Design a protein around this ligand. Structure first.
Ligand SMILES: CC(C)C[C@H](NS(=O)(=O)Cc1ccccc1)C(=O)N1CCC[C@H]1C(=O)NCCCCNC(=N)N
Ligand code: NA
Ligand code: NA
Lengths: 250, 27, 10
């Protein structure tokens, strides 16, 4: 997260860290959505141009964390993956369209002050909150700078940007399964997700029912916190039928 | 059912330091 | 860098 701040304790209890077993390192961010399901970006697990294709046994999920590097004894929980599920039309060849994946855990994680699931949106939540200007919140343990490493989880609030502005900011082909967020040059304020924040949640707090909903997943960008550039997020609601379908079946 | 309600904030009726920035943007 | 985690977890 560039130009964000230190998260408060328990401010993002759905925050998940995807951790490589060997070598023991940060792989991505991710989200807790139930006691056995974790949501992330597909590109976190599969991206052939970079020879990335993780299997279950290559990684671990760590839940309840604040500290990036430390083992948080009596606070975090570490879970093993039973099975990975990547969107069958995820487009790693061109623009990361349908950049989304689910992980089922071998055993349920216990909820605590530091561990709690985020809601997923239904049509009305999306209708009402996915508006240009409305701010969401992105969190992660990724780089603090485009060209570093945070001590604790970082957070930053960012406004959703108008679809034509997103489009005009890049040469990449934008789909309806994506949205972009970030401040414009004239807005003075700054912030962005960056390398290692990948797979993490973009959340919004419903002013109707005071609940947090994950509207997006950190997916891609050009540099980090560049002027005139914007972070792009998977549109969670647009892929929810797939999510329902996977969880309903498995 | 209890999704999205944080034990150390919503469940105790405490607010974090910047959630009002989100609220004020919802319009 | 990363503190070691319990071998329990592999
Ligand atoms: C090396 C290259 C510049 C990285 C890349 N960006 S890019 O400018 O090439 C544009 C792009 C996006 C998707 C597929 C192909 C090209 C991109 O972001 N990638 C290509 C595959 C995965 C994704 C990424 O790294 N996700 C990390 C999250 C970046 C968040 N950045 C941010 N909000 N500013
Ligand atoms: Na363009
Ligand atoms: Na920018």
């Amino acid at each position: 997260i560039v130009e964000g701040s230190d998260a408060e304790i328990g401010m993002s209890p759905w925050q998940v860290m995807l951790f490589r077993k060997s070598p023991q390192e940060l792989l991505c961010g991710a989200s807790l959505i139930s006691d056995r399901w974790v949501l992330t970006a597909a590109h976190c697990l599969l991206y052939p141009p970079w020879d990335k294709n993780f299997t279950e046994n290559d990684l671990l999920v760590r839940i309840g964390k604040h500290s990036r590097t430390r083992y948080e004894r009596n606070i975090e929980k570490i879970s093993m993956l039973e099975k990975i599920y990547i969107h069958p039309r995820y487009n790693w060849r061109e623009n990361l369209d349908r950049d989304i994946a689910l992980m089922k855990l071998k055993k349920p994680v216990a909820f605590s002050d530091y561990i709690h699931p985020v809601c997923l949106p239904d049509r009305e939540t999306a209708a009402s909150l996915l508006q240009a200007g409305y701010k969401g919140r992105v969190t992660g343990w990724g780089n603090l700078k485009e060209t570093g490493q945070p001590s604790v989880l970082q957070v930053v609030n960012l406004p959703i940007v108008e679809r034509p502005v997103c489009k005009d900011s890049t040469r990449i082909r934008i789909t309806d399964n994506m949205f972009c967020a970030g401040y414009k040059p004239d807005e003075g304020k700054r912030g962005d997700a960056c390398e290692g924040d990948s797979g993490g949640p973009f959340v919004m707090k419903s002013p109707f029912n005071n609940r947090w909903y994950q509207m997006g997943i950190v997916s891609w960008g050009e540099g980090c916190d560049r002027d005139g550039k914007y972070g792009f997020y998977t549109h969670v609601f647009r892929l929810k039928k797939w999510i329902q379908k996977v969880i309903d079946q498995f | 059912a209890d999704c999205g309600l944080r034990p150390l904030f919503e469940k105790k009726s405490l607010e974090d330091k910047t959630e009002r920035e989100l609220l004020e943007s919802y319009i | 860098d990363f503190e070691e985690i319990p071998e329990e977890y592999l």
